[PDB]
């Protein structure tokens, strides 16, 4: 042949730049993964094994490799778990496409072949899953507790798990609604006290103080979001301020969401100001010329409760407005105590959110990847044409996940994935790698499970990224 | 020291290569996007990382890229005219014009004078144009067959786009919008609405010319025999589009005087509007609540926040007039509308008309997750409405997918049998460029081009004028049975524009660049 | 250290260039000599300054030049067989074979497998042969028209030679000698004589087998009923081609004894020759004056210095035997001859025969200024007489001068549409190589090949199968009227030998070289 | 363009190599031509203006430069004059073809155009030529005297002119034979005396003596050519002569005298009175013991004769070569009326054999002289005179010299170039403009303006006739016929014909290939 024009040079540049990112984060997979040392440009040195944090500190200038960075962010938004696993899977797929492109297979044939393997891969993981009931709070407690044990705090996971379950079951109808909004649950952490003290508030709890306004209590509140001449101007400044208050008073708004301190006290209006926009969205769904009564919310009793360890908080209950919202109050000795307490709540809410959309449980420890690679090999024998080798390359790329967990466990990566493949042939998905005992063991008895949405979204989002990279012919720099 | 300090002139040898290399590089850039299987491309501006994006559209790539070559600049300008006027074939014009110049460069190495090559392409153009006229098949009767052809043309235009997956539901939207028109091909009559939320399959359609905009705060939901009058002026407050003028305010009473002066100025404006005897009022500027109550007290519906596209469209759909000056009463024509009703689609207040004069208009309501999806959905839909409106004016249709491009190349070959000496070689390269279009389509699909394209030559050689390429099964079949066809005006426009674009490059043997300022 | 010590092997793509460039370099060498206007060339041997010469003959150029690459040795050997078997079209085979590989080299860069190209050339070869059969017109009657066509064959064969001036006189000499044959194509029955003096137009034709060289010194001009007997031995002096033998001589009495016995040994052989009682004697060696007088005294003619080419021709003409041993009579068969004359042409004595067996034999006498003219005229006449032999065996003739080459290319082009995809491109390159032969002929004549070749393709496209190139007037005219034609056996052999030669080079992807000995 | 194959690089190499030869030699044209210094590789130097001598010392390795050397040699064989004129014309044509090749004209069109111009060139020179009678010896005498006036010796050209005329009239029939073979005329030169003394001998003359034979005169002699060396017995075959004692010494000595005596008796039986023995360097041609035996038979003995005279003696007096004594007989012998040795005062001892009385045409010119260099230049003067006479025999005409026919040729071909069409307009015109280099060179060596002189001649030839030209003796434009400057027509016709065939041969060469 000739191949004078070589567009594949950019293809190989995109694969090399994308594989370099997946090869780095690979060693951080699993609880036993090795820690990494990141040094900031200012000279600060930090050590963390979290994959989502390292990818943000890499400062990736390459366009194709930035797609994997955005791929990890899309995984945390939907499922919220398995950030490191997605980057590793997407890296092994592009590495397998290198051997296929050298054989002369066209990318569109490769791209369309992964879609058929993806549709078949979803059916395999679904049939082998374990259906569970969403209305049962015993499974939700055990699935969250065992999942948070592999997280940072394994001791207090038993306390924070029912706080997240009772919050979701309150804002979501059990076994009815398939969609859960994580922004409908607000977590407030303050210094002082201990994690043993937690309060689930059906209303909203904020961080603001009503100072210097001394009303501090408003019942049945409608909340809404919005030398002689020298002395005369001071009287005119009070007129302009009171003018805008008169229009508010006609509508009946007793609480405003932001010299005027005294005018708001005469009208018995609680002062809530310095509020973040993201915090307003939580209040938006819960409860001057354009200001009217129709845009006002509702409330029962507003007040500021000052405790020893929870600081100054605004407790507003009985909103009486269409919606379902709750609030969680978190206490703890130091800042790192309440920091990891809230981070464990986000991980708890994401796992519960995955169980609401898809009700199922699958084993961990590399089990879903080996069973997937086992059935796709037999499924590739029935296909004809170029789809035969493309599916086998998609199946063999699933071996990177179990081989990585076995490598971080000290075992032999080559001998482990070989023995497990025959265990799934005769047995079921229950077989897998147990990192706690350091050897091959039944994962079902180890009580290590993960929701189905984590594995399904991992294959769905990574495949769309791999197909998007292969379809790129070149890059053009405009101005 | 003939040309120095910024002034450069390429000689006959160098300006020859520079003219083609600059033009061929443009054609080779967008050639990967031809066909439904075409490749994507990444566009990133230098210095700004927020310009990242991926699109397979050949028209969008040529607009954002800069061109420093005056020879390649002519080819880019001819591509933008193709997209702005006809709307389809932007990639086809660029690729076909580039292949003519790539083959013309090899003929010059044979010492064939450029004027001789031009004389050959002019005779081959007439022979290739008559081939489409003989193969054009229209339908005077059988609107079912005429409507089915519109669905095939709409599904073909939507190919290689963001909507290509859901296009099956969109063919019913685009054809019905043009089918209800049944008349002049004015596209202002068909409004396009872009709303957030819902998937692409949730896009609705309204035949009563639904408005994308909401009016007022409290407005009547029904009105009988509403007279449409458009006006252009600020209805909100004083100092409209006036910068540099201030007002001295010494106290609060001075502000109340402005509020009284504002209500006094608005009252005089409402009086002149009511002297027209209208039941409805339209203006581009927002309407304040005080004149809104003056309109609601008299039954006049207050319409505000109109754009430039609204005044032009609201005039023809309702049969009204722009009427920028409402000062002199009853000197302007008023629109005719049977009913104006409020319809909520996408959690937004929308304005729906009924029984308007010439009520063949309609509106398509798009549904998408974000604005970037809606913007690309409108560009793909608007390009489809252009060729469908052209199909109503000329109902002749031809078969696409390599069928029409290969048929024209066969007529040029037979013309090469009777011809003088030098024009024979020139027309042969013209026929080879027509066969490059079905060849590139097969390359982007992964199929073997040399196998499929060469069989089409033997297919159209003896009978079988309807043969073509099938991308679905990767074989050759009847284009009439598979339902792949395009308009006749599109093929004639791409064929002539590509011939005129490549003709200008040959006529330029030298490029004189002056000293840049 | 896999390949060393002189043994090397070239890789796939490298031996692809090594095989093609080696063959094309041989092709590009003889292209300047193709045609009657073909350019000359200089050949200078290394170490010998006296070897400087000039010739336009393509066959002579290929024989003297050594060949290095083994791939080019196949092409040269196929050109050598073409000259020995036929004698015409040696350059046409090498040039046509080079054009096939030059086009095949561009097809490999298109990812066309070599086995696929071979399958295309085989099917195109059958169509090229069938086009010659319909165009070939033989003569079953009207021998005058057959003899007129024979003069056209001589004019084409003798073109591009040093004989072009007087060539019009040589057209009659070549045809007359072949018409007297009426038998197998063996040319040993027709003797060739090269003598100095006179001009080329003074060349005679003798039907009595006029010999090459003289005999003795004083010989009878005419003898009645001479019996021919060939013998091989020295009749001149003792010890012919004998080294190391000596004769002992004691004194002056034995000095003359070996001198008289030397004549006695010759006279003893003379007595044994006359035992047959013949009238004439022929020897390969010379004849001394003493046995020459013994021959003339008894009425026997003395013929001496008959080379190996003579003794084999004298055996069939005279109907005799080599008769190496004359020692005893009636051990050999003698010859029969009526009259032996002597004609002086070009300051030499020539021996004429009359009344001999095989009356179909004749001899053509050549006369020129220098030996270089006689040498070139011999190969020109020998090649002309061999081609005319095939015209008598096969009377079918075709029109040359670009007429026959374009007809075969037209049939291959029509077959390219009836063949599937991959075999269509390979046939077009095969038909394109056939159009390269009339193109090179026009280039060597200083005319425009672009116009002339293109007009022939348009002429043979619809009717007018007899159109061809006219080198005299520099335009296109009828070949039947202008009297230009070539033999069918020659064109059929050039067509097949060129296709088989290019098939071997294309099939070989690797060359394994060993260590030189 | 592309031009994958570039034959033009060989064409430009051939033209540049051929023009470089004509650029050097052009300065030697004319009687006033400049001289040159030729330094041989050994360090020896010499000064000569002869163009033919310089070209032999050039030692050109380039093929195109070698064909010009062969072109100058072919001109001396036919006409014998105008060697430098042919080389200059051959160099000027290729220089004008360079401008034609840049315009894109193919050489075959250029080569065919020069042949049509050559056809018209011969007709123009024929009409301008003045026909003269070959039987008239008055004009023929002044033709050889004028041609030898520009040669080395201008003093003796007067008396040597009729000596060459009478030698041709004897061996060539006047107004009959179109071709004349100069090989039948030989020149014998000896030291002493003067060139003014000339003797035309109808027989043969040799520079040897009758030594050792003391006869010196024979009347009615019989002559024959013996190639066999007369000496002691010697055989080409391997032999040996064994000498042991005094008995074997006399046995060999007596047989050496007996073997020679047996060979001498074979000559006496035939009656041959004059023995001409060819010189042989392999073995001794004649010994001392044979000198004693040949004197007893009273037979003239002559030896040391080159092979060139053997071919002349055969045709002159009718002898035949004899390679062996047994083959020596009366059939191979010639005859003559008088064969002797004529010894004059300063002419040395000459062998005069006259009165052959057989069929043939032969003559021998004997010219005396003082210095060996004086007799050699006399041989060149007679040889050049015979070449000029030979030109008048083949073609009878006379044309003016000093570049006169070059202007008339260049002027008329311009008018013919206007009547033609196609590429022949520029090709013939380039052939005409290249003919002005000959008169431009003669005006440069004469001390005049080369550009202004050629311009005036074109006007004088337009209104007048060929008489106008350049006179190098007076240094100005004058009547060529009145200045006694004339050249035969064959010199100018052969100059255009031979030069055209060489230029056409060079244009037909695309590439050179080295073989082994």
UniProtKB/Swiss-Prot annotation, chains B, C:
Reaction it catalyzes: ATP + H2O = ADP + phosphate + H(+)
Binding annotation for ATP: 35, 89-91, 486, 491
Primary location class: cytoplasm
Positions of crosslink type Glycyl lysine isopeptide (Lys-Gly) (interchain with G-Cter in SUMO2): 239
Entry-annotated residues carrying Phosphoserine: 51, 251
GO-annotated cellular components: azurophil granule lumen; cell body; chaperonin-containing T-complex; cytosol; extracellular exosome; extracellular region; microtubule; zona pellucida receptor complex
Modified residues (Phosphothreonine): 252
Main enzyme class: hydrolase
Enzyme Commission numbers on file: 3.6.1.-
Modified residues (N6-acetyllysine): 4, 145, 172
GO biological process: binding of sperm to zona pellucida; chaperone mediated protein folding independent of cofactor; chaperone-mediated protein complex assembly; chaperone-mediated protein folding; positive regulation of protein localization to Cajal body; positive regulation of telomerase RNA localization to Cajal body; positive regulation of telomere maintenance via telomerase; protein folding
Residue positions binding ADP: 35, 89-92, 159-160, 401, 486, 491
Statement: the UniProt record of this protein carries the keyword ATP-binding: yes
Pfam families named in the record: Cpn60_TCP1 (PF00118)
Listed GO MF terms: ATP binding; ATP hydrolysis activity; ATP-dependent protein folding chaperone; protein folding chaperone; ubiquitin protein ligase binding; unfolded protein binding
Compartments, as annotated in UniProt: Cytoplasm
Signal sequence bounds: none
Residues noted as binding Mg(2+) in the record, renumbered to the chain: 88
Subunit structure: Component of the chaperonin-containing T-complex (TRiC), a hexadecamer composed of two identical back-to-back stacked rings enclosing a protein folding chamber. Each ring is made up of eight different subunits: TCP1/CCT1, CCT2, CCT3, CCT4, CCT5, CCT6A/CCT6, CCT7, CCT8. Interacts with PACRG. Interacts with FLCN. Interacts with DLEC1. Interacts with SVEP1.
The protein's role, per its UniProt record: Component of the chaperonin-containing T-complex (TRiC), a molecular chaperone complex that assists the folding of actin, tubulin and other proteins upon ATP hydrolysis. The TRiC complex mediates the folding of WRAP53/TCAB1, thereby regulating telomere maintenance. As part of the TRiC complex may play a role in the assembly of BBSome, a complex involved in ciliogenesis regulating transports vesicles to the cilia.
Name listed for the protein in its UniProt record: T-complex protein 1 subunit beta
Top-level taxonomy: Eukaryota, Metazoa, Chordata, Craniata, Vertebrata
Curated annotation (Swiss-Prot), chain D:
Keywords: Acetylation, ATP-binding, Cell projection, Chaperone, Cytoplasm, Cytoskeleton, Hydrolase, Methylation, Nucleotide-binding, Phosphoprotein
SUPFAM superfamilies for this protein: GroEL apical domain-like, GroEL equatorial domain-like, GroEL-intermediate domain like
Domain of life per record: Eukaryota
Any one GO biological process: protein folding
Pfam families assigned to the protein according to its UniProt record, in alphabetical order: Cpn60_TCP1
Keyword Chaperone: yes
Residue sites binding ATP per the record: 30, 82-83, 151
Location relative to the cell: Cytoplasm; Melanosome; Cytoplasm, Cytoskeleton, Microtubule organizing center, Centrosome; Cytoplasm, Cytoskeleton, Cilium basal body
GO MF annotations, alphabetized: ATP binding; ATP hydrolysis activity; ATP-dependent protein folding chaperone; protein folding chaperone; RNA binding; unfolded protein binding
Cysteine-cysteine disulfides: none
Keyword Transferase: no
Residues binding ADP: 30, 82-85, 149-151, 402, 487
Modified residues (Phosphoserine): 13, 161, 179, 421
EC number: 3.6.1.-
N6-acetyllysine PTM positions: 265, 279, 296, 303
Catalytic activity: ATP + H2O = ADP + phosphate + H(+)
Positions bound to Mg(2+): 81
CC terms in the record's Gene Ontology section: cell body; cell projection; centrosome; chaperonin-containing T-complex; cytosol; extracellular exosome; melanosome; microtubule
Family: Belongs to the TCP-1 chaperonin family.
Known function: Component of the chaperonin-containing T-complex (TRiC), a molecular chaperone complex that assists the folding of actin, tubulin and other proteins upon ATP hydrolysis. The TRiC complex mediates the folding of WRAP53/TCAB1, thereby regulating telomere maintenance. As part of the TRiC complex may play a role in the assembly of BBSome, a complex involved in ciliogenesis regulating transports vesicles to the cilia.
Pathological condition linked to this protein in its record: De novo genetic variants in nearly every subunit of the TRiC complex, including CCT4, have been found in individuals with a broad spectrum of brain malformations, and clinical phenotypes ranging from mild to severe epilepsy, developmental delay, intellectual disability, ataxia, and other features of cerebral malfunction.
Subunit relationships: Component of the chaperonin-containing T-complex (TRiC), a hexadecamer composed of two identical back-to-back stacked rings enclosing a protein folding chamber. Each ring is made up of eight different subunits: TCP1/CCT1, CCT2, CCT3, CCT4, CCT5, CCT6A/CCT6, CCT7, CCT8. Interacts with PACRG. Interacts with DNAAF4. Interacts with DLEC1.
Name of this chain's protein: T-complex protein 1 subunit delta
Annotated source species: Homo sapiens
Underlying gene: CCT4
């Amino acid at each position: 042949y000739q191949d004078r024009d070589k567009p594949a040079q950019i293809r190989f540049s995109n694969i090399s730049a994308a594989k370099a990112v997946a090869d780095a984060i690979r060693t951080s997979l699993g609880p036993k993964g090795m820690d990494k040392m990141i040094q900031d440009g200012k000279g600060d040195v930090t050590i963390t094994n979290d994959g989502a944090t390292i990818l943000k500190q890499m400062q990736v200038l390459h366009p194709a490799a930035r797609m994997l960075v955005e791929l990890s962010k899309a995984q945390d938004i939907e499922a919220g778990d398995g950030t490191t696993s997605v980057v590793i899977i997407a890296g092994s797929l592009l590495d397998s496409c290198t051997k296929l492109l050298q054989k002369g297979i066209h990318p569109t044939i490769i791209s369309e072949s992964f879609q058929k393997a993806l549709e078949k891969g979803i059916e395999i993981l679904t049939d082998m899953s374990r259906p569970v009931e969403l209305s049962d709070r015993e499974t939700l407690l055990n699935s969250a507790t065992t999942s948070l044990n592999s997280k940072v705090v394994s001791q207090y996971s038993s306390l924070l798990s029912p706080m997240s379950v009772n919050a979701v079951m309150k804002v979501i109808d059990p076994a009815t609604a398939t969609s859960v909004d994580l922004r409908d649950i607000k977590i407030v952490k303050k210094l002082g006290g201990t994690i043993d003290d937690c309060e689930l508030v059906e209303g909203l709890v904020l961080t603001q103080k009503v100072s210097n306004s001394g009303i501090t209590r408003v019942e049945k509140a409608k909340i809404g979001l919005i030398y002689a001449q020298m002395d005369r101007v001071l009287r005119e400044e009070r007129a302009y301020i009171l003018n805008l208050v008169k229009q508010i008073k006609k509508t009946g708004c007793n609480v405003l969401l932001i010299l005027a301190l005294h005018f708001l006290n005469k009208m018995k209006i609680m002062v809530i100001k310095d509020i973040e926009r993201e915090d307003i969205e939580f209040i938006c769904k819960t409860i001057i010329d354009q200001f009217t009564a129709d845009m006002l919310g509702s409330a029962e009793l507003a007040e500021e409760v000052n405790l020893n360890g929870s600081g100054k908080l605004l407790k507003i209950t009985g909103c009486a407005s269409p919606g379902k919202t709750v609030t969680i109050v978190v206490r703890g000795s130091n800042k790192l105590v309440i920091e990891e307490a809230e981070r464990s709540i986000h991980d708890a809410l994401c796992v519960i959110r995955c169980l609401v959309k898809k009700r199922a449980l699958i084993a961990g420890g590399g089990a879903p990847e080996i069973e997937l690679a086992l059935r796709l090999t037999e499924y590739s024998r029935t296909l004809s044409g170029m789809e035969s080798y493309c599916v086998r390359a998609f199946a063999d790329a699933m071996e990177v996940i179990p081989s990585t967990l076995a490598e971080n466990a000290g075992l032999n990566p080559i001998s482990t994935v070989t023995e497990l493949r025959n265990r799934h042939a005769q047995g079921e998905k229950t077989a897998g790698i147990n990192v706690r005992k350091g050897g091959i063991s039944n994962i079902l008895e180890e009580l290590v499970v993960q929701p189905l949405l984590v594995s399904v979204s991992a294959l769905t989002l990574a495949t769309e990224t791999v197909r998007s990279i292969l379809k790129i012919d070149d890059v053009v720099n405009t101005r | 020291n003939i040309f120095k300090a910024g002034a450069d002139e390429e000689r006959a040898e160098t300006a020859r290569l520079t003219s083609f290399i600059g033009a061929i590089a443009i054609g080779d850039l967008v050639k990967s996007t031809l066909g439904p299987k075409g490749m994507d491309k990444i566009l990133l501006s230098s210095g700004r990382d927020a310009s990242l994006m991926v699109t397979n559209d050949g028209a969008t790539i040529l607009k954002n890229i800069g061109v420093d070559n005056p020879a390649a600049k002519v080819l880019v300008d001819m591509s933008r005219v193709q997209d702005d006027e006809v709307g389809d074939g932007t990639t086809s014009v660029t690729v076909l014009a580039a292949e003519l110049l790539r083959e013309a460069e090899s003929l010059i190495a044979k010492k064939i004078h450029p004027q001789t090559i031009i004389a050959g392409w002019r005779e081959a153009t007439k022979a290739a144009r008559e081939a489409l006229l003989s193969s054009a098949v229209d339908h005077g009767s059988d609107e079912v067959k005429f409507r089915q052809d519109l669905m095939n043309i709409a599904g073909t235009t939507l190919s290689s786009k963001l909507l290509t997956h859901h296009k099956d539901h969109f063919t019913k939207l685009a054809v019905e919008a043009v089918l209800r028109l049944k008349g002049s091909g004015n596209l202002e009559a068909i409004h396009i609405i872009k709303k957030l939320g819902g998937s692409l399959a949730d896009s609705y359609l309204d035949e009563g010319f639904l408005l994308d905009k909401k009016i007022g705060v409290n407005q009547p939901k029904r009105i009988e025999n509403a007279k449409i009058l458009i006006a252009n002026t600020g209805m909100d407050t004083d100092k409209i589009k006036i910068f540099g003028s201030r007002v001295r305010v010494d106290s609060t009473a001075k502000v109340a005087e402005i509020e009284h002066a504002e209500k006094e100025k608005m009252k005089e404006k409402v009086e002149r509007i009511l002297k027209h005897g209208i039941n409805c009022f339209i203006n581009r500027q927002l309407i304040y609540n005080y004149p809104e109550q003056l309109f609601g007290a008299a039954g006049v519906m207050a319409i505000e926040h109109a754009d430039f596209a609204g005044v032009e469209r609201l005039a023809l759909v309702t049969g009204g007039e722009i009427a920028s000056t409402f000062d002199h009463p009853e000197l302007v024509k008023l629109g005719s509308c049977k009913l104006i009703e409020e319809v909520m689609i996408g959690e937004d207040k929308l304005i729906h008309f009924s029984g308007v004069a010439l009520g063949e208009a309609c509106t398509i309501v798009l549904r998408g997750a974000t604005q970037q999806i809606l913007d690309e959905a409108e560009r793909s839909l608007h390009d489809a409405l252009c060729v469908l409106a052209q199909t109503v004016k000329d109902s002749r249709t031809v078969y696409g997918g390599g069928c029409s491009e290969m048929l024209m190349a066969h007529a040029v070959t037979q013309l090469a049998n009777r011809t003088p000496g030098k024009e024979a070689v020139a027309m042969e390269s013209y026929a080879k460029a027509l066969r490059m279009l079905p060849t590139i389509i097969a390359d982007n699909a992964g199929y073997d081009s040399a196998d499929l394209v060469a069989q089409l030559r033997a297919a159209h050689s003896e009978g079988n004028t309807t043969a073509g390429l099938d991308m679905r099964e990767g074989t050759i079949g009847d284009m009439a049975i598979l339902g792949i066809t395009e308009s006749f005006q599109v093929k004639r426009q791409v064929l002539l524009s590509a011939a005129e674009a490549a003709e200008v490059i040959l006529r330029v043997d030298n490029i004189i660049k002056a000293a840049p300022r």
